[PDB]
């Protein structure tokens, strides 16, 4: 038993809710919140900009030190950093950005990072400003992630389309 509430169950291990991931994280304080990161950990907009804003820019400060030490992530890769006031940990995961011409096949590799964590609160990778089809992103999630994932979908219209079209 965990504290996630109001989710629709899609599969044995995947759950989905129309929710603002920032508000959801503030309420649950999950062990892991997933950020929709880019390789530079520049948290300007989308989910990343919202999560970083909620930490009063502490996420960005930590991220800049990480990059200065380690260099950029790979597309499809991840790193574990602090969750600040939102979660114990933040798993920064880089899905391919279609608006940068990155290979969508890398979306499966991005989701594989979730399997290193027993339970996660997450957005749909590569959705939103990353330019992929969220229905496709949900399909890859269900077909790749084996650990327990609670997906937060900000847009109500999109949430209903994702549920109604789910196979
Ligand atoms: O579900 C989805 O449809 C997308 C929505 N996105 C976002 N994109 C741009 N700015 C944003 N600010 C936010 C503040 C709080 C929560 C989400 C966002 C967000 C990201 C997304 C959450 C799952 C992937």
From Swiss-Prot:
- Cell compartments where the protein resides: Host endoplasmic reticulum membrane
Q: How does it sit in the membrane?
A: Multi-pass membrane protein
- Catalytic reaction(s) noted: Thiol-dependent hydrolysis of ester, thioester, amide, peptide and isopeptide bonds formed by the C-terminal Gly of ubiquitin (a 76-residue protein attached to proteins as an intracellular targeting signal)
Recorded consequence of changing residue 31 to A: In strain: Mu/B.1.621
How does its activity get regulated?
Inhibited in vitro by GRL-0617.
Which parts of the sequence belong to the Macro domain? Answer: 1-167
Function, in words? Responsible for the cleavages located at the N-terminus of the replicase polyprotein. Participates together with nsp4 in the assembly of virally-induced cytoplasmic double-membrane vesicles necessary for viral replication. Antagonizes innate immune induction of type I interferon by blocking the phosphorylation, dimerization and subsequent nuclear translocation of host IRF3. Also prevents host NF-kappa-B signaling. In addition, PL-PRO possesses a deubiquitinating/deISGylating activity and processes both 'Lys-48'- and 'Lys-63'-linked polyubiquitin chains from cellular substrates.
Q: How does it assemble?
A: May form homohexamers. Interacts with N protein.
The name of this protein is Papain-like protease nsp3
Q: Which organism is it from?
A: Severe acute respiratory syndrome coronavirus 2 (2019-nCoV)
Q: Taxonomically, what lineage is the organism?
A: Viruses, Riboviria, Orthornavirae, Pisuviricota, Pisoniviricetes
Q: Which gene encodes it?
A: rep
Q: Which residues of the full protein are shown?
A: 1025 to 1191 of 7096
